[model samples]
Target chain A: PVLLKSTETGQYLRINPDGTVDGTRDRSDPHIQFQISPEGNGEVLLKSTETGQYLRINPDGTVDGTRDRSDPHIQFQISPE
Target chain B: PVLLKSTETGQYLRINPDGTVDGTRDRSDPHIQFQISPEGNGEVLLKSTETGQYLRINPDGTVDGTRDRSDPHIQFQISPE
Candidate 1:
């Protein structure tokens, strides 16, 4: 189980089955567990073992999710965890 | 010039020829000039006309850029300006 933490907010990235991608204050919560995969092109795709949807940020600055990894929003540059 | 502001830091997004993507307190700075493009999905591609590079968010929460639009890190959500 991997976790994604935000440098801006100091929170942890969490995903839900309903396609909700938000941050949680609880770092030890199960919601923060995310599986990171290399999507190529110098970016990575974020998914979770509990949730199938991929995490993405919308054009409106909203964090959401898409079903597949085809969306560019689902790709991100991950640093050393 | 299109300017992107950060909700977390309340700073404007800026890019440079050195692949430096950062924020500035001066909203009127010429560094904030960024060209936005549709990159499929809800993500938008940001290019600085002054610097000629795409604004990207790194896994470390530090912002940077790439020469091309192929990198998924360059894909981002832009709010209505």
Candidate 2:
């Protein structure tokens, strides 16, 4: 499983199938497992491997999960290590 | 910059051109910027956008940066998030 951190918030990105995305200190949960889909041009769409939900960032900068593939918030750039 | 959290370690992955990779509690550093290349089949090669170094996980489970693309440690699977 993969773990992803936010580009804005340094908090670890965690997903909940209940439609919640939270930044938390604990990293032991399986909700952090992410499957990424290439959106081309070095961008990607992250989905929860656990629930088959796509990761989406809100206009307010909060993260969440949705089933829509057309959601703009689902796209992200993989920054340098 | 995109911060990457290690699946094994909850700490954020940070890079040092000195060839160091450490898990840190703080997330203010720019060394976390990561660029990813598709390795095909949902896998990717993570690289530093700043120094152009690739992220490699050692057998010891520590992450590091390398110029070598052929390094097997550079590959990673993006799990669900």
Candidate 3:
């Protein structure tokens, strides 16, 4: 069962060094993402489309996040430069 | 512990339409693969290199195969057009 929660929203884009850009979600999906503050508050900082879950990043390359409890999707770490 | 079994042996090549190719395994991997038969005998037809296992294929697109018992690799169905 797909759960409905007020997932925080903002806009996200993934840009390649080659000057190409891909929307963080499916092209059919509305381009929304979480906004990150310099102070780190109230934003959907990052996400994983593969597991359909949002990801929380930490300074030390560790993660603190949430996912559907029962299925508990395969978790792989993600990083960006 | 790596288990050693007589995995069906033959050559396998993965080709992209662009004439570029990737050896079905690491280039260092001895170029061997399972061959399948129309009469179905004595050859390694297809393989699940992802699982280091051999697979048998019929004229139709289903698979018959083997893999290690312990690690039991992630099985994603493979197909070719």
TM-scores of the first chain across all predictions? 0.75, 0.35, 0.22
Candidate 1 chain B, run of 10 with poorest lDDT: B29-38
Collision count for each candidate, in order: 0, 16, 10
Predicted structure with the largest DockQ when compared to the true one? 2
Candidate 1 ranges beyond 4 A from true positions:
A7-10, A79-81, B1-81
lDDT of 3 at B17: 32
**Candidate 2 per-residue C-alpha lDDT over B7-60 given as tens digits, one digit per residue, 9 for 90 to 100:** 333345556779776555456767766766786666676777777788665544
Better of 1 and 3 by TM-score: 1
Candidate 2: residue A52 Cα off by (Å)? 19
By lDDT: ranked, best first: 2, 1, 3
List interface RMSDs for the candidates, in order. Answer: 12.8, 12.2, 20.9
Candidate 3 per-residue lDDT, tens place, B1-81, comes to 111111112112322233222323233433232222221232112333344443322123222344432221212221110
Native contact recovery (fnat) for each candidate is: 0.00, 0.14, 0.00
Worst lDDT window (10 residues) for model 2 chain A?
A70-79
**Local distance difference test, each candidate:** 0.51, 0.53, 0.26
